[PDB]
């Protein structure tokens, strides 16, 4: 048991893009975004 080995291995990968992607989703050209709450 240690799924997190193969699973979140990719976390270090996704993390680099995640910070950039979450930045492109909030860029402003995006239609979709998180509301003040989950609304």
């Amino acid at each position: 048991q240690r799924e997190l080995e193969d699973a979140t291995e990719t976390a270090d990968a996704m993390n680099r893009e995640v910070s950039s992607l979450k930045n492109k989703l909030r860029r402003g050209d995006l239609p979709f975004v998180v509301p003040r709450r989950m609304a």
Binding site: T10, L21, L25, L30, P31, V34, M38
Partner: protein
């Protein structure tokens, strides 16, 4: 209720297979697949509205290769880019401090 954090990962691959296997692959989401996906279970996260002239930008922000088809990791970073994007909102940082926000 459901198992909150458990359903998070569960519905990831569940919904991942729901709307993707509509046009093409059940692990591949083009614009229209993500569209319906978000319109159904993420309508709150549209903040205003997912338009079609907006979706050309949307898909392109969930596709670093720009083939108009989101792959698995891009689908999930998509997710975390919603959650992490929610950080300041839900946590309680109204544009407070440009650090971890």
């Amino acid at each position: 209720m459901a198992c909150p954090l458990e359903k998070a990962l569960d519905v990831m691959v569940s919904t991942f297979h729901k709307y993707s296997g509509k046009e093409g692959d059940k692990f591949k989401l083009n614009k229209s697949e993500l569209k319906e996906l978000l319109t159904r279970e993420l309508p709150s996260f549209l903040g205003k509205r997912t338009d079609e002239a907006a979706f050309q930008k949307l898909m392109s922000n969930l596709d670093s290769n720009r083939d108009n088809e989101v792959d698995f990791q891009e689908y999930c970073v998509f997710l975390s880019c919603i959650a992490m994007m929610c950080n300041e909102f839900f946590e309680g940082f109204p544009d407070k401090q440009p650090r971890k926000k």
